[PDB]
Ligand binder design. Structure first.
Ligand code: HEM
Ligand SMILES: [Fe+3]
Length: 403
């Protein structure tokens, strides 16, 4: 297996065959990188947690040797042409960047947000129940607009702007035209920049306001840093969630017995959302690291300066922790999944995500119980060649009845 990673996700109900055969060989294997390099590939679940929690495996893209797995040469160069992202800093510097935002995702904080989320979901579910289309693309009706608007709600954009925020955000993930996206971000970075300025003078009940207040009361303002935060949040939480919604439906639909459980008792939904996250693990290899020291792990001696890639999808399908990992079992209480990562960088909005999905799945199947795929499974175009797994478009329908 001189194989060169990454390997495309060809089947949405089983990870690349090569992945399993790699784990069967060892918890950690040195692999070939299509990008040209070479790096360590962690397939074992225990080792996955190990590295992701071990600070010796840096996430700083400013370091020579950082793996070009999910990164371009140009993408790496861009990151080295601006301040580091939270997703790219270590220890103290990281902590300092995360502490001031941890509060925006507490149980209480997110609790007050719930209603706003429900309303957004209900709205689009409505728009669906009134479409003049035979088949409807669940991706453009639900998947995309929901996470984006939920986030702008969080940041604090006025309701009177949802349409704008929805169109630019949606285009920033456009499939065609590298310029449309560029033009999308552009118009947004402008909106957000001024929106914040407005907030500085007469705030409200949003993240922006609360942030501007802390910086003032604490040390001093950082307009750019705040503008940067907004995008970090939108960026790391829009497509991931969207794709999770898409795959969540397809997964639930392709497993009736499981869908009935969720549809029968909504209290079982939260645990179902966890199984769905493990099952698909759409962030698979975004957890690339750069060893800054020599480390003995997984029975392998990793030398400093070498790249380390943690495969979350591989860890979440590790049979040594998840009995029959190949089966979609909403019932299993198997905690410890890594779809959200592990360690210092574990997903900051993992709970906002859990909330969205939970609300989306319940509402969707409660309001449109007979929802089914408008086309055969093999026809649904999955984003199997994308860094973050998902589905390009998902045609669907339901039964319009009479009494
Ligand atoms: C919906 C599915 C989502 C998945 C699967 C997901 C997954 C992840 C993963 C795996 C990481 C760690 C990456 C690494 O360590 O290199 C991460 C980080 C992060 N995610 Fe998400 N995420 C999701 C949604 C969100 C949402 C909704 C937000 C909030 C807007 C969010 C905010 C973040 C932030 C800020 C980080 C960086 C944390 C840090 O640097 O310490 N994520 N996410
Ligand atoms: Fe009726």
């Amino acid at each position: 297996a001189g194989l060169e990673l990454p390997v495309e996700r060809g089947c949405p109900f089983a990870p690349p065959a090569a992945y399993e055969r790699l784990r069967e060989r060892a918890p950690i294997n040195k692999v070939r990188l299509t990008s040209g390099g070479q790096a360590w590939w962690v397939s074992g679940h225990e080792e996955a947690r190990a590295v992701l929690a071990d600070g010796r495996f840096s996430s700083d893209k400013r370091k020579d040797g950082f793996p070009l797995f999910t990164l371009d040469a140009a993408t790496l160069q861009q990151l080295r042409s601006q301040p580091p992202l939270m997703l790219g800093m270590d220890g103290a510097e990281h902590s300092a960047a995360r502490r001031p935002v941890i509060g925006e995702f507490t149980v209480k904080r997110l609790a007050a947000l719930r209603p706003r989320i429900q309303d957004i979901v209900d709205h689009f579910i409505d728009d669906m129940l009134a479409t003049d289309q035979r088949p409807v693309d669940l991706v453009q009706a639900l998947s995309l607009p929901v996470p984006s608007l939920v986030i702008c709600e969080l940041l604090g954009v006025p309701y009177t702007d949802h349409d704008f925020f929805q169109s630019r955000t949606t285009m920033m993930v456009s499939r065609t035209s590298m310029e449309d996206r560029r033009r999308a971000f552009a118009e947004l970075r402008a909106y957000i920049d001024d929106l914040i300025t407005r907030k500085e003078s007469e705030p409200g009940d949003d993240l922006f306001s609360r942030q501007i207040a802390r910086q003032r009361q604490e040390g001093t303002l950082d307009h750019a840093g705040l503008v940067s935060l907004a995008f970090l949040l939108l960026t790391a939480g829009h497509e991931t969630t969207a794709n999770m919604i898409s795959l969540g439906v397809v997964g639930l639909l392709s497993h009736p017995e499981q869908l009935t459980v969720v549809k029968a008792n909504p209290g079982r939904t939260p645990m179902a959302v966890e199984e769905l996250l493990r099952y698909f693990t759409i962030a698979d290899g975004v957890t690339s690291r750069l060893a800054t020291e020599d480390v003995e792990i997984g029975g392998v001696s990793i030398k400093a300066g070498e790249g380390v890639i943690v495969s979350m999808l591989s860890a979440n399908w590790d049979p040594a922790v998840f009995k029959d990992p190949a089966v979609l079992d909403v019932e299993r209480g198997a905690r410890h999944h890594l779809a959200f990562g592990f360690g210092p960088h574990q997903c900051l909005g993992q709970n906002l995500a859990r909330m969205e999905l939970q609300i989306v799945f319940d509402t969707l199947f409660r309001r449109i119980p007979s929802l089914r795929l408008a086309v055969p499974m093999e026809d649904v175009p999955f984003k199997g060649d994308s860094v973050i797994y998902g589905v390009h478009e998902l045609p669907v329908t339901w039964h319009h009845h009479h009494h």
